[PDB]
Design a binder for this molecule. Sequence first.
Ligand SMILES: [Mg+2]
Ligand SMILES: [Mg+2]
Ligand SMILES: [Mg+2]
Lengths: 89, 89
Amino acid sequence: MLREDESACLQAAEEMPQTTLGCPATWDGLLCWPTAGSGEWVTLPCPDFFSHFSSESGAVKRDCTITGWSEPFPPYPVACPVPLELLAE
Amino acid sequence: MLREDESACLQAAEEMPQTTLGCPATWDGLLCWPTAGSGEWVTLPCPDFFSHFSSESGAVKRDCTITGWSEPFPPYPVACPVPLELLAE
Ligand SMILES: [Mg+2]
Ligand SMILES: [Mg+2]
Ligand SMILES: [Mg+2]
């Protein structure tokens, strides 16, 4: 469940140093992004609820640039699509 | 030769359909980027020459976004760095 993942992420995140190089670890509502260095990107699978909707693990990515993290790509509607009957489509 | 990679990429690129679905194959001066769908990204190794500087492939990403291709990431001098002697640095 997402509340527990959230609590794991946000607590781990507290154990990180105040000064990191690159991009610090971050919870974005759905996924815990691990710390990364400038010029690295991190690819994660969809959260675990996605196995009820797909055999594929999915792929979501964030680039760690020198101005900070990029937005997750592709957007979550695209990266981790839910059944249309849950959208009322 | 990089002029031979360029040529072969371009001759491949001129054989593609006229209509743009996704982001078209493109030659950025170092790499031949294949066609990609919206919301996909492509990762390529560094060009062949990099094999003189490192026993790594290196890795360079572009994102195919609904507004087009993003820039190569990380930027080439980070992604595929050249010996500092070459730049008398
Ligand atoms: Mg869960
Ligand atoms: Mg479950
Ligand atoms: Mg060559």
